[PDB]
């Protein structure tokens, strides 16, 4: 097998993962912003960046925000829609949670969310989290409501990449 560090090294070499901001380091114990995770999804699934389009009203969500082209791409793809469809808030500085990451990866991999799942996930996420656990993207002992650690996101991204390659529909 590969260690989490080796999985990070591989994904970094592939341009999918970056160091914890301010570093080139795995920092496997640290959290990740939804902005950073949008970029991970774009690189992981080979999505096209969308420049000069703004679908959200978050403060400092504009042409000067490095994350906008990635956030627009995952929005167009239907992987993410943000946290509030009235105020159009993505919460790009918010930390990506296990169940949020579960939704994005389940959606990207075309996996069926589990109906009437019984788990500790937020109501909207129960089916997404259940499908992610069933597919081996996260452990059943992961807290769906917790901020995902970079270790959990590296393991999930690596597993998602292996599933995509093995399905014969890799980008
Ligand atoms: C009342 O609490 C709010 O409940 C919302 C809907 O039930 C919840 O919305 C979810 O947000 C998640 C954020 O991450 C992703 C991966 C995304 O698409 O960006 O998934 C989103 C869910 O689909 C859901 N969003 C909506 C608009 O219903 C808010 O996060 C949550 N807001 C906050 C501030 O925590």
Q: DSSP states of 72-102 as a string? A: HHHHHHTS---SBTTTTB--SSSBPBHHHHH
Torsion of CA 100, 79, 163, 130, to 10 degrees: 40
Alpha-carbon distance 55 to 105, whole Å?
21
**Overall resolution, Å:** 1.7
b/e per residue, 109-132, with b = 16+ CB within 10 A? Answer: bebebbeebeeebeeebbbbbbbb
* Helix (H/G/I), strand (E/B), else coil: 147: strand
> 90 near 71, Cβ under 8 Å?
yes
Neighbouring residues of 90: CB distance < 8 A, sequence distance ≥ 6: 34, 56, 58, 61, 71, 75, 80, 82, 83
Q: What is the DSSP letter of 3?
A: -
Ligand 1 pocket (Cβ < 6 Å) reads 80-83, 85, 100, 103-104, 124
Atom number in ligand 1 closest to CA 122: 7
d(CA 75, CA 143): 25
Rounded to whole angstroms, what are the CA distances from 156 to 57, 86, 135, 162?
29, 31, 10, 10
Q: Is 27 exposed, middle or buried (0-12, 13-18, 19+ CB in 10 A)?
A: middle
Indicate which atom in ligand 1 lies nearest the CA of residue 97.
Answer: 14
Q: How far is the CA of 90 from the centre of ligand 1 (A)?
A: 9
Select from 164, 42, 43, 46 the least CA-distant residue to 106: 164
Query: Phi/psi of residue 33, each to 5°?
Result: -70, 155
Ligand 1 centre from 84 Cα, in Å?
A: 7
Q: Is 33 helix (H, G, I), strand (E, B) or coil?
A: strand
Q: Among 55, 72, 83, 87, which residue has the most ligand 1 atoms within 8 Å of its CB, making it the best to mutate?
A: 83
Using CA atoms, how far apart are residues 134 and 142, in angstroms rounded to an integer?
A: 12
Measure the CA–CA gap between 171 and 161, rounded to whole angstroms. 10
Residue having the nearest C-alpha atom to atom 29 of ligand 1 = 83
Q: How far, in Å, CA of 69 to CA of 38, rounded? A: 9
96 Cα to the center of ligand 1, angstroms: 11
**Experiment used for this model:** X-ray
Cα of 23 from ligand 1 centre, angstroms: 29
Q: What is the crossing angle of helices 126-134 and 98-108, to 10°?
A: 70
Atom of ligand 1 nearest to the CA of 81: 18
CA distance 44 to 26: 17
In angstroms, the CA 110 to CA 132 distance is: 11
Q: Compute the distance between CA of residue 43 and CA of residue 32 in angstroms, rounded to an integer.
A: 16
Torsion of CA 9, 16, 32, 146, to 10 degrees: -90
């Amino acid at each position: 097998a590969k260690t989490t560090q080796e999985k990070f090294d591989a994904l970094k070499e592939a341009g999918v993962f970056s160091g914890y901001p301010g570093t080139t380091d795995a920092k496997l114990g640290q959290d990740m912003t939804r902005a950073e995770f949008a970029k991970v999804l774009v690189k992981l699934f080979g999505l096209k960046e969308i420049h000069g389009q703004y679908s959200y009203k978050d403060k400092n969500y504009d042409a000067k925000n490095w994350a906008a082209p990635f956030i627009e791409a995952v929005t167009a793809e239907g992987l993410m829609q943000g946290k509030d469809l009235t105020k159009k808030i993505f919460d790009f500085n918010g930390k990506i949670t296990v169940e949020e990451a579960s939704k994005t990866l389940v959606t990207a991999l075309k996996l069926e969310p589990v109906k009437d799942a019984q788990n500790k996930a937020t109501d909207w996420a129960k089916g997404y989290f259940e499908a992610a656990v069933n597919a081996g993207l996260f452990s059943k002992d992961a807290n769906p409501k917790a901020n995902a650690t970079r270790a959990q996101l590296v393991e999930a991204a690596f597993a998602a990449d292996e599933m995509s390659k093995g399905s014969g529909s890799h980008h």
